[PDB]
Write a protein that binds this DNA or RNA. Sequence first.
RNA 1: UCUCUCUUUGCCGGCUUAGAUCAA
RNA 2: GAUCUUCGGAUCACUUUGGUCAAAUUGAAACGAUACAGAGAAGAUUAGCAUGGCCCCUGCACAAGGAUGACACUGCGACAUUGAGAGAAAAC
Lengths: 51, 51, 96, 48, 125, 234, 44, 48, 48
Amino acid sequence: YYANTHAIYGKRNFDDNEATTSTDLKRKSQKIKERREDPGDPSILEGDGAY
Amino acid sequence: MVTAEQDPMEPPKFRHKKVPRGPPSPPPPVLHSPPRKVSAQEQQDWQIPPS
Amino acid sequence: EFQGRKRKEFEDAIRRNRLAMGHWMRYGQWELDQKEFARARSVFERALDVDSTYIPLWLKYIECEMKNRNINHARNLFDRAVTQLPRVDKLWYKYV
Amino acid sequence: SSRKFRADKRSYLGALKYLPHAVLKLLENMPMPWEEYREVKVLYHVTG
Amino acid sequence: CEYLHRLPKDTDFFNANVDCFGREKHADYRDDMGGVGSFLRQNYTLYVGGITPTDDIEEIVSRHFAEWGDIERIRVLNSRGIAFITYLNEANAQFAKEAMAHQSLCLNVRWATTDPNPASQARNQ
Amino acid sequence: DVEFPSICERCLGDNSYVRMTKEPLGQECKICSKPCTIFRWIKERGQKPGKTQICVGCARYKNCCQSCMLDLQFGLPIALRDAALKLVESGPTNDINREFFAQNQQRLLSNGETAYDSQEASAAARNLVKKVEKRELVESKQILKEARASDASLNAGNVSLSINMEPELADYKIRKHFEQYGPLKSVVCSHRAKCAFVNFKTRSSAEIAAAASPLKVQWGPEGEVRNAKLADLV
Amino acid sequence: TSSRALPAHLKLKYRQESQGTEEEVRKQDLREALLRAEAAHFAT
Amino acid sequence: NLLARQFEGRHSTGVAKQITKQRVDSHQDLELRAAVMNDILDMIPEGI
Amino acid sequence: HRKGLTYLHLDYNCNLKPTKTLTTKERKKSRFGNAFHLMREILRLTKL
RNA sequence: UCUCUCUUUGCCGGCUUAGAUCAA
RNA sequence: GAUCUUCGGAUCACUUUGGUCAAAUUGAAACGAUACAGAGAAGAUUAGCAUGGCCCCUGCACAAGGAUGACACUGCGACAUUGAGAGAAAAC
Ligand SMILES: [K+]
Ligand SMILES: [Mg+2]
Ligand SMILES: [Mg+2]
Ligand SMILES: [Zn+2]
Ligand SMILES: [Zn+2]
Ligand SMILES: [Zn+2]
């Protein structure tokens, strides 16, 4: 069912240019993680690195 | 299919209303012995006076 | 709305005393005077459901079918009547 | 007294059936005279 | 916002059950003809009532209604402040109903009743 | 075994694998007013879940989809279907009579005989389109000047009108006709009066539209219909 | 639902060995026993 | 029971009512009248 | 509420006092049963 | 065989301490 | 990302959204008041228990109350006509 839903989304958006593997999984996670901002450090609460 | 579980606290969801009883099955044939003759004398012998 | 008035009074009268056949006969007659079909048959079949052994109601229904030229309806009704009450000769005599 | 929760009123009122059980469980665990406060493991409806 | 802020166009059909304006349609069609139509009957005209200033009621209501959608028929009573604009589509009709309520032309906008005209019923059917 | 609800695939989503929930006796049918179970599913990601609106006794007597209220053979609203096709007599609109009819009708329909066959429906559809296409294809003198001069004075066998250039059919047809003759402000019309008066942003556009002259006109309710009867003797 | 509709007497009682089960009555000869008892009562 | 009667209605139709020492006479009268009607309907021959 | 008895005041100590003089209709409609009153009094003890 | 009239013509709320009492 | 592994990778975890329905005139009930009459049993005052059901209300209730809770309590043609006369008509 997840495969079918992914196919439906790929057909709708035409954005189907991906592969699948084991280290490929980590590599796909890497770019998305890079786009994410850092998680702050706990015990810093009001801004300036707030967790 | 997954049966959504119900809130244990729900009261009865809706009112129950009465409906008139539906029509019955068609009546069967009567199949009597032939009617007898009573005559006016016996018709009068069961005439009851008013109270 | 006058038809509504008469229909409501007839319906409540037959609801109060369901065994009074005179009310059903009067209902069939009054309703038959203007809206000649459909609900007339409905009222009469309801009366038959209440008591199907009442010969006057059978004869009344047949006669009201002869009034309005419905010959095939009336002959089906005779068939039902004679197959329900084979030992009363009024229905047989009217049929023949 | 708010329309934001008007979907929960039926269940909230239906819990009246189980209210006396809550009363019994509350009175059964009353703090004894020698203790200032008592923390109780509680079970609550998500409706409140 | 999570809903369209534009105007319904010709081909904006929705399911029969759902009101074209996002709400849901019941079956009893109410008694005061207030909120939302009934899926059991298909009508595109709505009662609008209110001010009866002068004889130019026809033109003022035409100006105040045509900008909500496409119009098929307008009938305005001269004696009393009653108009019965008939829209082409359900979408524009119900959008206008929800857009012309308590507005200035307050307007008593409701749903239309079954026509008693033996001639109007024939052409509607 | 109270297995599945009759739902059309247009509103069952374009995914061949769906997940849906059922809660028995969770709702009353919006026709039967009888207890009925709801089925809730997601048509597609990014959409509020759909749900059935009527019992299974309905959508059987009506051959319809429990969710979107469209008939399963023609895909058009059930109200419009029963109004136009008029296949089989419908039920009443009042509560007690409609519920009694629905219950007894469900009983007799469960007795085995189908209340809906599609042969008659296709035949009725073809007949309907056929009927639509076929639908496509001294006393007069005194009722002539009785008030034609009078209203003109107040605020203004055969007879021939005059053309001046002094400076069934719905109104949107008029609207999409005058767009090439200028922008529109409002078009006030009446079928009984047969008179349509139009307004533009400038009088020049109206006058050039009038100059197009060589069915057309150039410049209670009965009071406005006196000149409308002239169409028979125009 | 009601006070008198609550569960009660959930165990149905069956005739035991000496209480006159169907087997014992079937084995028994009721005609002669009836005759002796009628004679005994007549004797009084 | 209170919440059920609140959200459901009386359900008054189809319920029986026991004889409670005040209806004893008025019910004994009904039973006797019904019995006499039965006997009347029986002892009268056909078509009388 | 839900019964229309919005003129009855249930103060925070669980006393049911009308906010106005009631007519015979209102006095007959606003009459509660033993279950509601018993629950109200148990609630009053709990609040004490 | 019509019309009018008459005649023959078999015909189609309960209970209890009567509920209890009673002078212009 | 953590773990190993040998820099091929393997493990570890894997698809939310309780929906009388979108920020309260126009889809959760049932009416105030004023104006009209204005309290069962054949005089008059008045105890009640019932019968009927698309009438309910209070009640936990298969108690009991709400004016004996209220409304209702009637009425007709499977009559065969001949019994006769009279003027007419068509007929003994
Ligand atoms: K009394
Ligand atoms: Mg009583
Ligand atoms: Mg009574
Ligand atoms: Zn928006
Ligand atoms: Zn569908
Ligand atoms: Zn249904």
